[PDB]
Enzyme design. Structure first.
Site, PDB file in Angstrom:
ATOM      1  N   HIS A   1      -1.659  -9.111  49.260  1.00 54.48           N
ATOM      2  CA  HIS A   1      -3.124  -9.784  49.588  1.00 54.48           C
ATOM      3  C   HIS A   1      -3.236 -11.071  49.955  1.00 54.48           C
ATOM      4  O   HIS A   1      -4.010 -11.319  50.551  1.00 54.48           O
ATOM      5  CB  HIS A   1      -4.774  -9.696  48.677  1.00 54.48           C
ATOM      6  CG  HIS A   1      -5.330 -10.253  48.964  1.00 54.48           C
ATOM      7  ND1 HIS A   1      -6.244  -8.919  49.834  1.00 54.48           N
ATOM      8  CD2 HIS A   1      -6.341 -11.376  49.024  1.00 54.48           C
ATOM      9  CE1 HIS A   1      -7.415 -10.340  50.011  1.00 54.48           C
ATOM     10  NE2 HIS A   1      -7.053 -11.064  49.603  1.00 54.48           N
TER      11      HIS A   1
ATOM     12  N   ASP B   1      -4.352 -12.958  53.267  1.00 54.03           N
ATOM     13  CA  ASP B   1      -5.603 -13.941  53.111  1.00 54.03           C
ATOM     14  C   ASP B   1      -3.782 -15.411  53.722  1.00 54.03           C
ATOM     15  O   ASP B   1      -4.872 -16.193  54.614  1.00 54.03           O
ATOM     16  CB  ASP B   1      -5.201 -14.386  51.827  1.00 54.03           C
ATOM     17  CG  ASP B   1      -6.268 -14.203  51.280  1.00 54.03           C
ATOM     18  OD1 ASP B   1      -6.454 -14.291  49.778  1.00 54.03           O
ATOM     19  OD2 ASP B   1      -7.106 -13.564  51.695  1.00 54.03           O
TER      20      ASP B   1
ATOM     21  N   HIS C   1      -6.709 -21.288  50.040  1.00 56.42           N
ATOM     22  CA  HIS C   1      -6.798 -21.408  51.205  1.00 56.42           C
ATOM     23  C   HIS C   1      -6.529 -22.870  50.958  1.00 56.42           C
ATOM     24  O   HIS C   1      -6.500 -23.099  52.340  1.00 56.42           O
ATOM     25  CB  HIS C   1      -8.922 -20.851  51.188  1.00 56.42           C
ATOM     26  CG  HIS C   1      -8.735 -19.528  50.854  1.00 56.42           C
ATOM     27  ND1 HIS C   1      -8.188 -18.701  51.821  1.00 56.42           N
ATOM     28  CD2 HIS C   1      -8.979 -19.283  49.397  1.00 56.42           C
ATOM     29  CE1 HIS C   1      -8.078 -17.233  51.099  1.00 56.42           C
ATOM     30  NE2 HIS C   1      -8.864 -17.466  50.472  1.00 56.42           N
TER      31      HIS C   1
ATOM     32  N   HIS D   1     -10.158 -12.644  55.982  1.00 60.20           N
ATOM     33  CA  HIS D   1      -9.632 -10.890  56.121  1.00 60.20           C
ATOM     34  C   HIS D   1     -10.255 -10.371  57.336  1.00 60.20           C
ATOM     35  O   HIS D   1      -9.677 -10.257  57.336  1.00 60.20           O
ATOM     36  CB  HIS D   1     -10.646 -10.461  54.841  1.00 60.20           C
ATOM     37  CG  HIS D   1     -10.327 -10.919  53.499  1.00 60.20           C
ATOM     38  ND1 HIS D   1     -11.012 -10.023  52.475  1.00 60.20           N
ATOM     39  CD2 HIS D   1      -9.458 -11.295  52.675  1.00 60.20           C
ATOM     40  CE1 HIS D   1     -10.614 -10.961  51.715  1.00 60.20           C
ATOM     41  NE2 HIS D   1      -9.617 -12.162  51.737  1.00 60.20           N
TER      42      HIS D   1
HETATM   43  C1  LIG Z   1     -16.402  -7.365  38.421  1.00 54.46           C
HETATM   44  O1  LIG Z   1     -15.328  -8.464  38.949  1.00 54.46           O
HETATM   45  C2  LIG Z   1     -15.226  -9.280  39.558  1.00 54.46           C
HETATM   46  C3  LIG Z   1     -14.375 -10.596  39.143  1.00 54.46           C
HETATM   47  C4  LIG Z   1     -13.745 -11.556  40.210  1.00 54.46           C
HETATM   48  C5  LIG Z   1     -13.852 -11.050  41.421  1.00 54.46           C
HETATM   49  C6  LIG Z   1     -13.233 -11.463  42.501  1.00 54.46           C
HETATM   50  C7  LIG Z   1     -12.693 -11.212  44.113  1.00 54.46           C
HETATM   51  C8  LIG Z   1     -12.443 -11.778  44.917  1.00 54.46           C
HETATM   52  N1  LIG Z   1     -12.241 -13.141  45.118  1.00 54.46           N
HETATM   53  C9  LIG Z   1     -11.715 -13.789  45.551  1.00 54.46           C
HETATM   54  C10 LIG Z   1     -10.213 -13.504  45.669  1.00 54.46           C
HETATM   55  C11 LIG Z   1      -9.664 -15.110  46.672  1.00 54.46           C
HETATM   56  C12 LIG Z   1     -10.095 -16.617  46.710  1.00 54.46           C
HETATM   57  C13 LIG Z   1      -9.282 -14.202  48.251  1.00 54.46           C
HETATM   58  O2  LIG Z   1      -8.950 -13.250  48.184  1.00 54.46           O
HETATM   59  N2  LIG Z   1      -9.620 -15.096  49.164  1.00 54.46           N
HETATM   60  O3  LIG Z   1     -10.059 -14.304  50.337  1.00 54.46           O
HETATM   61  S1  LIG Z   1      -7.483 -15.059  45.958  1.00 54.46           S
HETATM   62  C14 LIG Z   1      -7.032 -13.319  45.664  1.00 54.46           C
HETATM   63  O4  LIG Z   1      -6.922 -16.289  46.911  1.00 54.46           O
HETATM   64  O5  LIG Z   1      -7.478 -15.565  44.671  1.00 54.46           O
HETATM   65  C15 LIG Z   1     -13.043 -13.736  43.626  1.00 54.46           C
HETATM   66  O6  LIG Z   1     -12.756 -14.973  43.830  1.00 54.46           O
HETATM   67  C16 LIG Z   1     -13.758 -13.184  42.801  1.00 54.46           C
HETATM   68  C17 LIG Z   1     -14.858  -9.423  42.323  1.00 54.46           C
HETATM   69  F1  LIG Z   1     -14.786  -9.034  43.616  1.00 54.46           F
HETATM   70  C18 LIG Z   1     -15.252  -8.833  40.855  1.00 54.46           C
HETATM   71 ZN   LIG Z   2      -8.156 -13.125  50.291  1.00 55.10          ZN
END
Ligand SMILES: COc1ccc(-c2ccn(CC[C@](C)(C(=O)NO)S(C)(=O)=O)c(=O)c2)c(F)c1
Ligand SMILES: [Zn+2]
Ligand SMILES: COc1ccc(-c2ccn(CC[C@](C)(C(=O)NO)S(C)(=O)=O)c(=O)c2)c(F)c1
Ligand SMILES: [Cl-]
Ligand SMILES: [Zn+2]
Length: 300
Positions: A238, A242, A265, A79
């Site tokens: 989002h 990323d 990623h 980010h």
């Molecule tokens: C209170 O319950 C919660 C459950 C899960 C999460 C949460 C949030 C973000 N993430 C990273 C996402 C990801 C890889 C990303 O943004 N990487 O940069 S993504 C969108 O690509 O899946 C997570 O793993 C998990 C949380 F905060 C609270």
């Molecule tokens: Zn992210």
């Protein structure tokens, strides 16, 4: 004039917590000389460990992009790197007092605001771009990530969540940054995760710091954030944020187009490694006249 490399005009400081570690962390962004790139520094260690934000230093890609060197890591760089790519920052030292970049509000917004408040500084060296000359595609399973030649910078992404909050929603987006603003339309898109997973994630020292204060938390049939969404397509936007941050591990801004289908990623980094290795698919270019270039930047 020519398109110049940019660094920070003033030191930037932020405090927050790691999304995954939950650790309090002090972040310090400093100016750096021409051709430094973005370099992360674990200043809690003595001597420090410095890790250039480059694809060759990516070590883990589970739930975030992780840089590794020796025995140590810098977690969740994507980010912050997305904000730096979006604003055109070439050179900077990123000091951290712990192993993970602070999550802030889950988006790149707070970083973008902190940086633009301090201002950018153009430097007396041409800014280098990586121009895509040939298509480069990587796949694994049902996931795909592709670079295609394109006179500009454009990112498209498609997600496919088998979940009642996602079915019937906008799960594809395309952003052409000659006509759409990174700051206004991408930077504020927050990370997201699923409440179902939180006890399991924490059992693995993941999302230890995550809450509705720094993420969209999706329950079984509703979004938990009582104040709502910033964009109707915030989830896919989002993923685009990323992708921009992961792509900036090339070390230079891109002239070309990225298309991701359920990419994450891990596959983003495999695409970068394949591109770097396929040297006849790209070239380094500079612009002696900003007026004629396919990408433009706002004033520093
Ligand atoms: C209170 O319950 C919660 C459950 C899960 C999460 C949460 C949030 C973000 N993430 C990273 C996402 C990801 C890889 C990303 O943004 N990487 O940069 S993504 C969108 O690509 O899946 C997570 O793993 C998990 C949380 F905060 C609270
Ligand atoms: Zn992210
Ligand atoms: C990883 O490689 C990258 C290459 C280029 C960009 C990039 C460059 C410039 N710009 C600004 C456009 C513009 C002035 C704007 O957004 N102003 O707010 S615009 C719509 O007016 O042309 C962006 O957004 C994004 C990037 F993020 C990543
Ligand atoms: Cl080839
Ligand atoms: Zn080739």
């Amino acid at each position: 004039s020519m398109i110049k490399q940019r660094t920070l005009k003033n030191i930037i400081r932020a405090t927050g917590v790691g999304l995954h570690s939950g650790e309090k962390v002090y972040l310090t962004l400093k100016p750096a000389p021409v051709d430094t790139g973005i370099v992360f520094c674990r200043t809690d260690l003595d001597p420090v460990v410095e890790i250039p934000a480059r694809a060759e230093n990516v070590g883990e890609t589970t739930m975030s992009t992780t840089l590794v060197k020796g025995d140590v890591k810098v977690d969740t760089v994507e980010h912050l790197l997305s904000a730096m790519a979006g604003l055109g920052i070439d050179n900077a030292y990123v000091e951290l007092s712990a192993s993970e970049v602070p999550i802030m509000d889950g988006s790149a917004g707070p970083f973008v605001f902190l940086i633009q408040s301090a201002g950018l500084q153009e430097q007396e060296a041409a800014k280098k771009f990586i121009r895509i000359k040939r298509e480069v595609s990587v796949e694994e399973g049902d996931k795909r990530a592709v670079f295609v030649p394109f006179d500009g910078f454009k990112v498209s992404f498609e997600i496919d969540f088998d979940h009642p909050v996602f079915r019937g929603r906008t799960q594809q987006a395309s952003v052409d940054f000659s006509s759409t603003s990174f700051v206004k339309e991408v930077s504020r898109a927050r990370t997201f995760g699923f409440m179902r997973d939180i006890e399991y994630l924490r059992s693995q020292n993941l999302a230890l710091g995550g809450s509705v204060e720094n993420a969209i938390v999706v329950d079984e049939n509703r979004v938990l954030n009582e104040d709502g969404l910033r964009y109707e397509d915030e989830f896919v936007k989002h993923k685009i944020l990323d992708a921009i941050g992961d792509l900036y591990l090339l070390g230079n801004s891109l002239i070309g187009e990225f298309r991701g289908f359920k990419s994450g990623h891990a596959l983003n980094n495999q695409l970068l490694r394949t591109l770097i290795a396929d040297k006849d698919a790209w070239e380094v270019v500079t612009f002696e006249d900003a007026r004629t270039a396919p990408i433009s930047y706002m004033r520093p």
